[PDB]
Structures are given as C-alpha cells and as structure tokens.
Amino acid sequence: GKITFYEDRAFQGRSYECTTDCPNLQPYFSRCNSIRVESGCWMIYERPNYQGHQYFLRRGEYPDYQQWMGLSDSIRSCCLIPPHSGAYRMKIYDRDELRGQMSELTDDCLSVQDRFHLTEIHSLNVLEGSWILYEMPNYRGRQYLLRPGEYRRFLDWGAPNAKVGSLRRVMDLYL
Known about the structure:
By secondary structure, the chain is mainly beta. It has 2 domains: 83 residues, Crystallins (Gamma-B Crystallin, domain 1), CATH 2.60.20; 92 residues, Crystallins (Gamma-B Crystallin, domain 1), CATH 2.60.20. The chain contains 1 helix and 14 strands. The strands form 4 sheets. A 4-stranded antiparallel beta sheet has the order 2-1-3-6, with no helix packed on it. Strands 9-8-10-13 form a 4-stranded antiparallel beta sheet, with no helix packed on it. Strand 4 and strand 5 form a beta hairpin. The chain starts with a strand and ends in a 6-residue tail after the last strand. Monomer. This is Gamma-crystallin B. Crystallins are the dominant structural components of the vertebrate eye lens. Belongs to the beta/gamma-crystallin family.
C-alpha cells in the first residue's frame, strides 16, 4: 500500500509518503488537510499509537479532510490494513464474552437494525478479513477498525458504548 499526507488542502504544502504502519507521524508533518491513497486500505488516526478518532480510506484522492469523513486536520498515526482474499467472516453476539444469540456475517451490513433487529452488539469474533464498525447505519458516524480476532466487550474495539449501526468489509476500491 501507499498513502501520501499533505499539510494543506488540494494536495498542497509539505507532504510525507508512507507504505507501512506508522505509530507517530508528528515528526513528519504538523497537520493534514488532504491525502492521496495510491493503493491499499488504510486506517488513519487523530493521535499517535493508533489512538483517538479513526478514519477509513481506500485508493482515491481526498482534497479535504471532510472527504474521509474527518473532523479536523489532526492525523498522527496510520496503519496499512493487510489485503484480504476470499470470503470475509465475523460473528456477532448479543452478550459479552462471545455468549448469547449469535449470527454470522460473510458480507457487508448497511443496517444492523434491518438485518438483525439489533441496535447494539456486545461481543465479536472477526474470523476472516478486517472490517469497519460504524456507530450509525449506512457507514456513518464514529468508525472503529475491527482487525481479525476476538472482541469480548465493546471497550475492546475502542467504542464508548455497544451501539452499532453498520459493518463494512475492508477491501480496496474495485479495479
């Protein structure tokens, strides 16, 4: 993957190019108002060490932070989401510790309410591929990167509560 950060909008000002994870971008730029993703899937973060607000980006050009649904020009860390082939897979539970009613997803879910008649998810088991968990339906609201693995409680994916609106498989822009 390859991503380039620009201090000013429309790809202006000082820039920095990354082709791997980076827990601290502060030494390279003081602000980010535009981004060019040459290839790959990326999660960029407001604070160092993958902390703070998270935003998902794929191949494309983002002339302003609003284009990646960002809140500001503060970006201090980024991670390259490993490319994934084949089927995606994750199980959702209505209780913590992977207990309670369970359902399995192998494709995107634009509305957890419409699909499972659930407004909250208490534990997860991401078996295949990375996903993005959205607070609101239709990929809106706060974002939380879900890497493969077990999430015993909502705190594990970094959310303040168990509300979930939509779930998206992380895959690069089709070409």
